Ligand binder design. Structure first.
Ligand SMILES: COc1ccc(O)cc1-c1c[nH]c2ncc(-c3cncc(C(=O)N(C)C)c3)cc12
Length: 262
């Protein structure tokens, strides 16, 4: 798609942000942008740009342009001024980022995931570190790793793939299998990260025993201050059987109701 194509000279790099990711300026609009460069495999990078062209949602990071004719290749996106959600929650004023703001953040993220669910994408690395925060608690999900997968289907990760174990669904840990329901599992963990203002999940629990614990129905306990209804949602996301987990449309509806009633 050539409406997306721009010359690399249209952008000036201002600050390196790691991970081959720069804060840049789109000079004709004096616009601050994020720029991902390639110093992963080329074809993988180009397909990631291709997927992002199809994505249009208020809570998914918006593609602005690509430079894909000649190396080095660029993917240019909107810039989210406050950076990743994990550090944002860890460093925030909790009187400002209070319970209703946490609900608002969860509603936004579930809205993005509902859109992906509907458009046959999976994310596969849903976590606070991969959400970005703009002004007035706007949250966007980073969408650079999206894979096409018809919502009824399963992706099998390449042999020897390494996971973020504590965000990873049981079926992914055991069988390298991913679906939108494994994104639902990860969303549950993300909810826990939000509720704890960015605590690390399963604290102190040895990574090699996480799977064994999950199969015996161990789950993280309700965070201090966490509303019971939100915790119930976490627990639904963490059902062992992927088909028992709620869809993102249901999750989003549930949060929309909670947020509106707050
Ligand atoms: C081409 O865009 C990307 C490619 C890779 C990536 O990981 C993210 C982005 C991305 C898009 N919009 C963004 N808006 C803002 C920031 C950003 C600003 N400041 C600090 C941080 C941060 O938390 N750390 C550096 C740890 C992130 C990143 C982005």
């Amino acid at each position: 798609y050539d409406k997306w194509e721009m010359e690399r000279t249209d952008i000036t790099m201002k600050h390196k942000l790691g991970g081959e990711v720069y804060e840049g300026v789109w000079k004709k609009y004096s616009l601050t942008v994020a720029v991902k460069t390639l110093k992963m495999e080329v074809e993988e990078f180009l397909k990631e740009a291709a997927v992002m062209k199809e994505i249009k949602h208020p809570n998914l990071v918006q593609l602005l342009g690509v430079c894909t004719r000649e190396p080095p290749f660029y993917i240019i996106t909107e810039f989210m001024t406050y950076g990743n959600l994990l550090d944002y929650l860890r460093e925030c004023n909790r009187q400002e980022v209070n319970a209703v703001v946490l609900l608002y953040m969860a509603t936004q993220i579930s809205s993005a995931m509902e859109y992906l669910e509907k458009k046959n994408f999976i994310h596969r690395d849903l976590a606070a570190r991969n959400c970005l925060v703009g002004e007035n608690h706007l949250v966007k999900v980073a969408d650079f790793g999206l894979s096409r997968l018809m919502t009824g289907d399963t992706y099998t990760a390449h042999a020897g793939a390494k996971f973020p174990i504590k965000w990873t669904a049981p079926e992914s840990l055991a069988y390298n299998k991913f679906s939108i329901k494994s994104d639902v599992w990860a969303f549950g963990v993300l909810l826990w990260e939000i509720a704890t203002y960015g605590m690390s999940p399963y604290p102190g629990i040895d990574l090699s025993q996480v799977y064994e614990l999950l199969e015996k129905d161990y789950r993280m306990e309700r965070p201090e201050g966490c509303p019971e209804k939100v915790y119930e949602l976490m627990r639904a996301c963490w059902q062992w059987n992927p088909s028992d987990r709620p869809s993102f449309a249901e999750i989003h509806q549930a949060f929309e109701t909670m947020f509106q009633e707050s």
